[PDB]
Design a protein around this ligand. Sequence first.
Ligand SMILES: *[C@@H](C)[C@H]1/C(=C/c2[nH]c(/C=C3N=C(/C=C4\NC(=O)C(CC)=C4C)C(C)=C\3CCC(=O)O)c(CCC(=O)O)c2C)NC(=O)[C@@H]1C
Ligand SMILES: *[C@@H](C)[C@H]1/C(=C/c2[nH]c(/C=C3N=C(/C=C4\NC(=O)C(CC)=C4C)C(C)=C\3CCC(=O)O)c(CCC(=O)O)c2C)NC(=O)[C@@H]1C
Ligand SMILES: *[C@@H](C)[C@H]1/C(=C/c2[nH]c(/C=C3N=C(/C=C4\NC(=O)C(CC)=C4C)C(C)=C\3CCC(=O)O)c(CCC(=O)O)c2C)NC(=O)[C@@H]1C
Ligand SMILES: *[C@H](C)[C@H]1/C(=C/c2[nH]c(/C=C3N=C(/C=C4\NC(=O)C(CC)=C4C)C(C)=C\3CCC(=O)O)c(CCC(=O)O)c2C)NC(=O)[C@@H]1C
Ligand SMILES: *[C@H](C)[C@H]1/C(=C/c2[nH]c(/C=C3N=C(/C=C4\NC(=O)C(CC)=C4C)C(C)=C\3CCC(=O)O)c(CCC(=O)O)c2C)NC(=O)[C@@H]1C
Ligand SMILES: *[C@H](C)[C@H]1/C(=C/c2[nH]c(/C=C3N=C(/C=C4\NC(=O)C(CC)=C4C)C(C)=C\3CCC(=O)O)c(CCC(=O)O)c2C)NC(=O)[C@@H]1C
Ligand SMILES: *[C@H](C)[C@H]1/C(=C/c2[nH]c(/C=C3N=C(/C=C4\NC(=O)C(CC)=C4C)C(C)=C\3CCC(=O)O)c(CCC(=O)O)c2C)NC(=O)[C@@H]1C
Ligand SMILES: *[C@H](C)[C@H]1/C(=C/c2[nH]c(/C=C3N=C(/C=C4\NC(=O)C(CC)=C4C)C(C)=C\3CCC(=O)O)c(CCC(=O)O)c2C)NC(=O)[C@@H]1C
Ligand SMILES: *[C@H](C)[C@H]1/C(=C/c2[nH]c(/C=C3N=C(/C=C4\NC(=O)C(CC)=C4C)C(C)=C\3CCC(=O)O)c(CCC(=O)O)c2C)NC(=O)[C@@H]1C
Ligand SMILES: *[C@H](C)[C@H]1/C(=C/c2[nH]c(/C=C3N=C(/C=C4\NC(=O)C(CC)=C4C)C(C)=C\3CCC(=O)O)c(CCC(=O)O)c2C)NC(=O)[C@@H]1C
Lengths: 100, 57, 160, 160, 160, 160, 36, 67, 161, 161, 161, 161, 36
Amino acid sequence: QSISYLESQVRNGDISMKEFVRRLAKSPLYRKQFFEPFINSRALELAFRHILGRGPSSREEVQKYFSIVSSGGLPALVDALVDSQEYADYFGEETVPYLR
Amino acid sequence: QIVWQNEVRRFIPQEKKLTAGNPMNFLGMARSINPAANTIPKVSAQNINIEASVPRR
Amino acid sequence: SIVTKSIVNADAEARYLSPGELDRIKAFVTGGAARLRIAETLTGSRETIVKQAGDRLFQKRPDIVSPGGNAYGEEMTATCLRDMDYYLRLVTYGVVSGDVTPIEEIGLVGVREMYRSLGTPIEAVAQSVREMKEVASGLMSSDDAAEASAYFDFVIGKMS
Amino acid sequence: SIVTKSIVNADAEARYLSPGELDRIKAFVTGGAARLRIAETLTGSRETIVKQAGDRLFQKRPDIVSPGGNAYGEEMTATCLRDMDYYLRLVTYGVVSGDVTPIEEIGLVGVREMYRSLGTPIEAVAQSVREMKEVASGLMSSDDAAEASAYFDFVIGKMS
Amino acid sequence: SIVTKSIVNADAEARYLSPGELDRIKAFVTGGAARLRIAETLTGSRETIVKQAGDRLFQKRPDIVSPGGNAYGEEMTATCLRDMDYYLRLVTYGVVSGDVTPIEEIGLVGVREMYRSLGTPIEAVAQSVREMKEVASGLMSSDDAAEASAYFDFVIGKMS
Amino acid sequence: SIVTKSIVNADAEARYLSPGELDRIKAFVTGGAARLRIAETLTGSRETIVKQAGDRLFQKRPDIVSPGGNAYGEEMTATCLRDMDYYLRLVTYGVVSGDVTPIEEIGLVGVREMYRSLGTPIEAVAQSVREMKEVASGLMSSDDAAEASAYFDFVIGKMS
Amino acid sequence: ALRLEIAETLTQNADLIVSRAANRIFTGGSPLSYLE
Amino acid sequence: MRMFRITACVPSQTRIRTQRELQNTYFTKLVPYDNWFREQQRIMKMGGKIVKVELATGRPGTNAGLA
Amino acid sequence: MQDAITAVINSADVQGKYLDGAAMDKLKSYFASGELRVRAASVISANAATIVKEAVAKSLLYSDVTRPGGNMYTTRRYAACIRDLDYYLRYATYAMLAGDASILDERVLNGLKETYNSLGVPISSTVQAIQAIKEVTASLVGADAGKEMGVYLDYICSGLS
Amino acid sequence: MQDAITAVINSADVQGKYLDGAAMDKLKSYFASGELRVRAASVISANAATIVKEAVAKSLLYSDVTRPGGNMYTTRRYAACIRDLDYYLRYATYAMLAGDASILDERVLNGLKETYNSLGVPISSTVQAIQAIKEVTASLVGADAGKEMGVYLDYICSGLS
Amino acid sequence: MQDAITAVINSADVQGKYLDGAAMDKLKSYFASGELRVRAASVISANAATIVKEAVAKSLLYSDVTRPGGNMYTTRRYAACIRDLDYYLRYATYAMLAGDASILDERVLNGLKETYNSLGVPISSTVQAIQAIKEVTASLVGADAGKEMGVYLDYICSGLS
Amino acid sequence: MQDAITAVINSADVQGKYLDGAAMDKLKSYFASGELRVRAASVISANAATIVKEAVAKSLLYSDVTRPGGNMYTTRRYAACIRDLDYYLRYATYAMLAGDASILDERVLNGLKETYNSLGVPISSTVQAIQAIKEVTASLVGADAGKEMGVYLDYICSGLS
Amino acid sequence: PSQVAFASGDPIPQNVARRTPGPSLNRFKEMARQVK
Ligand SMILES: *[C@@H](C)[C@H]1/C(=C/c2[nH]c(/C=C3N=C(/C=C4\NC(=O)C(CC)=C4C)C(C)=C\3CCC(=O)O)c(CCC(=O)O)c2C)NC(=O)[C@@H]1C
Ligand SMILES: *[C@@H](C)[C@H]1/C(=C/c2[nH]c(/C=C3N=C(/C=C4\NC(=O)C(CC)=C4C)C(C)=C\3CCC(=O)O)c(CCC(=O)O)c2C)NC(=O)[C@@H]1C
Ligand SMILES: *[C@@H](C)[C@H]1/C(=C/c2[nH]c(/C=C3N=C(/C=C4\NC(=O)C(CC)=C4C)C(C)=C\3CCC(=O)O)c(CCC(=O)O)c2C)NC(=O)[C@@H]1C
Ligand SMILES: *[C@H](C)[C@H]1/C(=C/c2[nH]c(/C=C3N=C(/C=C4\NC(=O)C(CC)=C4C)C(C)=C\3CCC(=O)O)c(CCC(=O)O)c2C)NC(=O)[C@@H]1C
Ligand SMILES: *[C@H](C)[C@H]1/C(=C/c2[nH]c(/C=C3N=C(/C=C4\NC(=O)C(CC)=C4C)C(C)=C\3CCC(=O)O)c(CCC(=O)O)c2C)NC(=O)[C@@H]1C
Ligand SMILES: *[C@H](C)[C@H]1/C(=C/c2[nH]c(/C=C3N=C(/C=C4\NC(=O)C(CC)=C4C)C(C)=C\3CCC(=O)O)c(CCC(=O)O)c2C)NC(=O)[C@@H]1C
Ligand SMILES: *[C@H](C)[C@H]1/C(=C/c2[nH]c(/C=C3N=C(/C=C4\NC(=O)C(CC)=C4C)C(C)=C\3CCC(=O)O)c(CCC(=O)O)c2C)NC(=O)[C@@H]1C
Ligand SMILES: *[C@H](C)[C@H]1/C(=C/c2[nH]c(/C=C3N=C(/C=C4\NC(=O)C(CC)=C4C)C(C)=C\3CCC(=O)O)c(CCC(=O)O)c2C)NC(=O)[C@@H]1C
Ligand SMILES: *[C@H](C)[C@H]1/C(=C/c2[nH]c(/C=C3N=C(/C=C4\NC(=O)C(CC)=C4C)C(C)=C\3CCC(=O)O)c(CCC(=O)O)c2C)NC(=O)[C@@H]1C
Ligand SMILES: *[C@H](C)[C@H]1/C(=C/c2[nH]c(/C=C3N=C(/C=C4\NC(=O)C(CC)=C4C)C(C)=C\3CCC(=O)O)c(CCC(=O)O)c2C)NC(=O)[C@@H]1C
């Protein structure tokens, strides 16, 4: 199971690893394997370790990201996760996320 | 020598194949030992006397 | 098995294993080879005991296969022999385990309610199991059959 | 199905289903009798298609039944015809569903790794499904043949 | 459009179109003659529908033309009728395209910010396009009104 | 290349080379003479590998040289034994490099869709490299051919 | 095996090594009076 | 889906404190339209410079047929 | 998730058999009810907000819960309660369109009781709110599809309890 | 992307006018050719791998590109090349179903010329491969659907060149 | 719970078949290993308290756990820890006799991690205690019996961790 | 994780003393076995598809697990079981070359019980698969290396049971 | 060959000492010395 289109876009580098993570997380494959079998709260708890490499840190953080995933769903949750100060601070643009 | 034409002709569906606990495995066994049924013992209750034919000991 | 029964009893009294139960596990461990031989003979000949005991059951109780009976019919006699094969397999399990708790757990708890729902005469099933132990005693050697008939005996005591 | 696809997409976007998907759902609902008819036609001819297509595969490519082949052996050929029955059942599932999601979720994910392990040639499996397509299209009416062969070529395209 | 959303789903899942969605595009193509007939009668009645709906809007809510409302004056009422004409054009566009995607990508998302910066009551313009859908359902035939009313009600829901 | 994997892993871990990894590079440099010895023995006996693997293949699996296969006449077999020479060259590259990294660089991955587009049996290519393996083990000393078979079996495992 | 025999050497004479180091460093008395 | 071809350099302001590995702060990126406003705001708040940006994807001024 | 089609397909598949008429009639019944489900879903998607509005007005407003000390006192908690009822209505519409309550215990109910117990949310009050949603959408849609909607709403309530 | 109906709807929206006959003639043409496009797409998806293998057999095999030192020599490179070829086939199928080549000149030809110039891929050889694909599709699906495919395929050729 | 014999019997009953050759081989292996298990159980039942005594003296006495503020400071905490060690040693003896760790799942490890997490018990300190139990038990009981006891006590440690 | 060397150094560091009398014996036994353990790792890593092939063919194929109604029915589940057996073989190789089962404790047995109980994977059938793995490795690598792999494979089996 | 068996062979028992009273009981050690 793979997306060779996104793999080729990483391979020539027109999108970097950040856009690869964003598109792969809003892809239907991740939507089937980690968004369909869960509630929205458990889905965002898993999306934190899949994108940011860590767990949710505070009640207000869980509150904010639950409001985001309730307002706009999985693409809004993924976009809010990747377009954050923490993601750009830790993994930049080309580094694969890692379990912190 | 193994031959595949008779195997293709003898192919059976797996859902039609018999498993362990199916009593149809013993259907041919019950064909083999045919049980001896009883001829019908025609009885009439009106020809039975209750007081005498009941055992007394 | 006897090991599980001894462990359950020792846990119930919150103690380690008594040396009497250690001796019973030791003796079962040493004598398990005869039980394995008995179970091997039974699973090798397992159609023969069911065949002869079903024949003897249909001789001694032809009301079973008479019309209006529980096992009247080809498929019903097939299910009868299926139940006989089930109880034979359970007897092999009990002979291997050395204790009758697997037989009790699989096929002796709720058997009365099951066969009452099915309309099946429980004493006639007990007669079939007794005839199975007769055929197995004829098939096996004397001491091995005398040891293996006690699991049949427990089945007879629970069902009849 | 398309109902599952539309509900899953609307759930991922966190929105109700638009009428632009609701008309698609009701069109799929109304156009169901043809797919149902193709489904009972295929499950009526479920045996003979498998028999003829297996015969055609083992006459076209005798390397499958050659010594040293993957299906050398009577039980191996029996399991090969069973796999043909499996994929015909999945084709009937996709026909009666109106979607490729049952075939994808049951017998298309991990097939390459599975037959890479088992040594079975994936192009010969694709040839088997193609031969089932030709036998079914010969057996049934031409528009229904195209409708069933649509899912059939989806299966052989995911195979190769 | 529904065709471009089908191919967006297709290259999102990174494969060719499914047979179910191909037959779905066939159903859309066959129904497109009826949608185009609805387009002809709506663009023929593009004046009388919006004029009667505007008259009904001012009759329901006189506070719009009263002092304190947003649309006070002849040019303000002309721009209100121009907005209703644009939204009627958008509903005809959606009936042509088969989905609510052109309404969404022209004049339906951001309408909260639009009428917040304008000061226009969003429930009042929702009531205005509701009178548009009532006069449209009055002027259409039953099947055509049932087809257009789903897109109209999507406009009601996203502009309420 | 062991030093390639050294630089890649040390850059991923983001520190200098550990003393154990430096001892690994010592071991690889000292074994470089032996692996180039194996390399020049293989490129000395390259052609007999190709011919004996080819005709042993054509006697063990004659389907492809038969009609219905991919090997027709002379030019198809010429391209096939050219592929055999190519894979033998890649085996010598892996031997002289000490790792299968240049085998994956030129050819070890993409071969399945390569031979699926070409219609070529991947398992027959794997078996081809198999008789390459034991013909090389026959001609060259087996205790020193363990090193060459350590890449040969990885090649046949990837093409299996 | 080489690292093991180096360890066997160094653990055997560890008191000697720390005694020589302590006598090198400290003056004015015996540093080895209260070894732990 | 309309997108942007951007090219930018964003230095890390916390790499000295955090003692992490280094990345090339200059990159050529393909970014979607819906995420480009938030991405650009992230770049300018991080302190990086966007030195090139073009609408390489879509036509400018398309009213319908966006995604 | 599973709709009725995937439900009967997996029910045939777990026993490994093909489609028989005792399974084909299920798909025929689903295709009989499909246009009713589509029209009810269109009505509910058009009137999604006002169902929640009159449901909260019928059940939760002017009660103990909106008063100081109640669970939906602050505007954040009120908006969270409206968001929860929007979740319940949308997923019940999904279950009504699918004809099978798989998405309810697969995306709503599997942990929501524990979450509400940890938050202190009154489960009985949410059950009464969902019942108010059921009465409002039964008056709004009709009895025939309102019963099918209420089946999945009671499924949500039973999972919450 | 932008198909035929959204293209004419955008052309109407730029002038701010309702759809008239000057676009509805093309709309009727699209709805007349729609089932032809769908059946041709079904045939192309049926024979998608075979079109690629006959195209590489008739245009790309036994050439200097698949000789060593060429631009198709290594196995990863050949896999990438056939990946590009059935990418072009599938996106041409997308444009053929759409009725416009917005998808082709956007989500394929965004930077394809520049990345092929940076890699060293022969543009003329890829054009010959696309012409081979066009000949195979024209010989496989028909005359009118073949030339409808050929319009988008030499549009791809003009984008590459 | 179940032993190795009842595990074989339950597997054969779930399969629905009689005891085949591999089942007889596994039974013969257990009957071969039974005597060492019995004598090991006798040794452990002899030295039940003393193994716990030297294990806790080996790992936990004169440490931060028994110092003030640690979780074994008070006498009731010491008695509860000795009670836990007695439970672990007795159930490991039971698992050694049965030849299966199923009783550890049924009786011990089913909720003990949540129990210790609610209690505040340092599971690292309990893991070191059970490692000391392993060492003292393998000192007294032999080599192969030491391996079996070590496997089951490491299973208890893995369930804790 | 930790290995035998780290376990020795940690034990000596907890004692505060050097490697006096038995730590040296454990280390020299480890380094004596190490080169043959590396050779066994080379053989297993080279042949790793064949071990899982003969294991699935010996133990799990042609069974209720693979037939419909079983836990290995669908191809996704079959490929997942193949990947799990590859995981077991690879982490058994890891533990066999480390000389300690701490890698199995921290990366295998930490969540294996809970993922299998949540998924529904048959514990007894997984144990039989790992037994087929250990006899196939004993046949393919040797008796001594087979036992050295089989002690960690039986540790994984005990973690399953 | 048979020197593969590190884990599968006979285990080497370690010499693990009982824990002693530490330097937090230096006052009580001095107290016990004056008790004698
Ligand atoms: C003979 C026993 C087997 C076999 C071989 C066979 N191969 C081809 C054609 C080609 N094979 C390749 C593959 C490669 N070229 C490379 O440079 C590399 C890596 C070094 C590989 C893996 C290619 C590109 C071709 C096309 C010809 C060309 O090189 O231009 C054929 C011919 C098929 C045809 O239709 O012409 C054959 C017969 N086929 C078998 O069945 C045996 C397994
Ligand atoms: C003709 C189809 C080819 C052939 C077949 C072949 N298959 C097997 C073995 C198995 N195949 C499967 C596959 C499936 N089971 C499923 O439930 C599904 C999805 C619906 C699939 C795809 C399985 C499970 C087996 C194992 C048998 C079992 O039930 O346990 C074999 C046997 C190989 C062996 O080593 O035993 C064969 C021969 N082989 C060919 O060459 C034909 C191309
Ligand atoms: C044969 C082994 C048996 C079988 C297995 C089976 N496994 C899965 C899926 C999973 N297995 C794991 C386990 C691990 N993941 C890890 O990373 C590690 C340590 C390295 C382990 C031990 C997990 C997490 C899954 C789920 C997701 C995944 O695929 O990784 C399945 C599939 C379950 C399903 O229904 O999809 C199966 C079937 N089943 C049997 O019956 C054999 C006895
Ligand atoms: C030192 C010889 C002279 C010099 C250096 C200097 N560099 C920066 C800023 C950065 N330099 C880098 C370097 C790299 N990017 C990469 O991708 C790699 C390879 C892995 C390297 C080495 C980076 C990333 C930065 C940004 C800071 C960061 O840590 O992210 C500065 C700071 C400029 C400022 O005002 O902040 C300096 C001073 N300039 C000199 O004058 C020295 C003579
Ligand atoms: C309004 C005065 C005139 C004007 C505006 C207009 N802007 C856009 C779209 C965008 N503008 C920006 C630029 C910014 N990025 C930032 O971070 C900031 C704040 C510092 C700004 C101002 C961006 C990124 C967009 C794209 C929106 C997005 O990325 O989501 C549009 C829309 C263009 C379109 O729809 O294609 C418009 C209309 N143009 C005018 O005509 C007004 C006079
Ligand atoms: C008065 C300035 C305007 C207005 C008021 C109005 N409010 C309501 C009803 C409610 N308002 C709230 C809001 C709050 N609850 C809180 O705890 C807080 C913050 C401390 C707020 C802001 C609530 C909960 C209700 C419901 C009543 C209840 O207690 O349950 C109404 C009634 C509407 C109805 O349908 O019942 C009205 C009329 N209306 C105006 O016109 C003024 C602009
Ligand atoms: C409204 C009927 C009643 C009620 C609601 C209420 N809910 C919350 C907050 C949360 N609700 C959820 C529930 C879900 N998570 C999911 O993923 C799904 C399905 C997809 C549901 C239904 C969650 C996780 C929260 C917490 C999120 C957050 O705190 O922001 C609150 C707020 C509690 C608080 O402490 O702020 C309330 C009040 N309570 C009532 O009294 C009404 C009867
Ligand atoms: C094959 C027709 C010719 C060939 C080409 C060739 N292609 C690559 C690899 C790449 N192919 C693409 C193309 C795309 N990726 C996408 O996502 C899309 C949109 C759907 C397209 C069109 C790209 C970007 C690459 C770059 C790297 C990658 O694999 O993604 C190569 C390999 C270059 C290399 O070795 O690094 C080659 C050689 N060459 C020929 O001779 C054939 C005529
Ligand atoms: C002295 C009057 C008698 C005596 C004592 C003795 N005690 C120990 C060891 C321990 N005693 C305790 C008890 C307590 N710890 C507490 O915190 C409290 C309450 C405040 C009590 C009652 C503990 C925990 C130990 C273990 C040592 C430790 O702290 O870790 C010993 C040592 C035995 C050994 O094996 O080391 C002795 C000798 N013995 C006598 O005969 C006197 C009568
Ligand atoms: C001893 C190794 C370490 C440790 C132990 C400790 N445990 C408790 C308290 C409890 N432990 C249990 C656990 C069990 N439940 C069961 O069913 C079984 C057998 C299968 C066990 C072992 C329970 C229930 C308790 C609670 C008993 C109670 O309520 O008192 C304590 C006491 C803590 C306290 O009383 O507050 C202690 C100290 N902790 C350590 O530090 C030792 C290293």
